[PDB]
Design a binder for these strands. Structure first.
Length: 376
DNA sequence: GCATGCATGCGCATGCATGCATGCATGCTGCATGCATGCATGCGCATGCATGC
């Protein structure tokens, strides 16, 4: 139940299976062994000055793309801190990302690469899924000829990543089931034979196609994506991938691609090992200096566009954005092996949230993007 | 161009013509008993012949 090239399962979800294995004396090993030379290497690299760039660079070493896009995948892999209350009530740290933008980009490869690095996952198309196919169903076993219950797409993705491609092409009936999985990370089934609540602790990675040929900078974002504006606010990060014609970016991309048809970064093994180590041992906790900045940032974000709320030009800010900042600060702290979330983490989180939506080039009144200011 | 109702396939649940073994009981039938009958047998007695005297 291990592989060098894939990540280790989340121990936060299998606590009692570990206890049962010891009571049953089965030596099936779930997590991998770490020698001390390799653990010394871990801190030797974790001390490096350019850790953040190096990690972002080694995520997908064959996708010439902005490092902001890759950093989101890197922080999605680490995940937020899972918190358990002793009076019932669970808070989880799963990150949800949307990749909107023109076609003819490398969004598709990101989803495939993330499918193949995460231990548990399922790949779904837009107009190829049903509610029954995502939740559960009853089937006839050709061996015993009786009726048994079988798991669905989202329940099989418990403690992993689920990749939904062409999210905008999906029916309102099928989009209905995702609300509960994005709110409470559960599913409630009341069908003939089963009345129970299931655990779906999964990360959502979705890509959407813009209306018409290309993204139109002259129109607002709410008019370019066929998705209700209220649904757009449930995602932690929204990535606008825009295409601009610029001669030195094109030159670099062409050389990059042609170099692959001939005959520093961290190899796959070391990357996965580092991520598993961090996800396994350390646990970050927030401080007051971070709380001040979090509250200030949320108030500042809400105060913006207070007048531009009746008209759906920009995406209105809600409490889920506050929770997104919390989650991203905790993930950035987990990277670099700290147990303390300082002010740098919150500043980086807010920087990333604004940079994803391209808020450094938007007219706050007409929701339009100046492409002369969108630099590669 | 937007809103609407119809007809087209999914996705459940139930009934239904085929088909074959098992335990109980039916229904016949081969077997054992009893008996009538008529032909042959194993027998002792009376007659007629042959052999002395």
């Amino acid at each position: 139940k291990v592989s060098d090239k894939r990540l280790d399962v989340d121990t936060s979800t299998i606590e009692q299976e570990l206890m049962q294995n010891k009571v049953d004396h089965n030596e099936v090993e779930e997590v991998r062994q770490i020698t001390d030379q390799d653990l010394a290497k871990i801190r030797e690299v974790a001390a490096r000055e350019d850790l953040y760039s190096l990690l972002a660079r080694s995520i997908a070493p064959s996708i010439y793309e902005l490092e902001d896009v890759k950093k989101g995948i890197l922080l999605q892999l680490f995940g937020g801190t899972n918190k358990t209350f002793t009076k019932g009530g669970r808070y989880r740290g799963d990150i949800n990302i949307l990749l909107c933008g023109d076609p003819s980009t490398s969004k598709s490869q990101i989803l495939q690469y993330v499918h193949k690095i995460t231990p548990r996952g399922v790949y779904t198309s837009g107009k190829g899924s049903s509610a029954v196919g995502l939740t559960a169903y009853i089937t006839r076993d050709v061996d015993t000829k009786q009726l048994v219950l079988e798991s669905g797409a989202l329940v099989l993705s418990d403690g992993g990543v689920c990749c939904i491609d062409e999210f905008d092409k999906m029916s309102d009936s099928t989009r209905s089931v995702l609300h509960e999985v994005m709110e409470q990370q559960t599913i409630s089934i009341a069908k003939a034979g089963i009345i129970t609540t299931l655990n779906a602790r999964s990360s959502i990675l979705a890509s959407a196609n813009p209306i018409g040929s290309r993204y139109n900078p002259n129109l607002p974002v709410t008019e370019n994506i066929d998705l209700p504006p209220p649904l757009l606010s449930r995602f932690d990060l929204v990535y606008l991938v825009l295409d601009k014609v610029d001669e030195k970016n094109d030159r670099e991309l062409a050389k990059h691609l042609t170099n692959l048809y001939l005959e520093d970064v961290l190899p796959v093994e070391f990357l996965t090992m580092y991520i598993s180590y961090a996800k396994e041992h350390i646990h970050p906790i927030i401080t007051e200096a971070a709380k001040t900045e979090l509250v200030r940032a949320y108030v500042g974000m809400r105060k913006m566009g207070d007048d531009s709320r009746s008209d759906e030009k920009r995406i209105t800010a809600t409490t889920r954005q506050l929770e997104s900042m919390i989650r991203l600060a905790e993930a950035h702290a987990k990277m670099k092996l700290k147990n303390v979330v300082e002010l740098e983490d919150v500043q980086e989180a807010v920087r990333l949230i604004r940079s994803a939506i391209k808020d450094y080039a938007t007219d706050p009144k007409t929701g339009k993007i100046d492409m002369n200011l969108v630099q590669t």
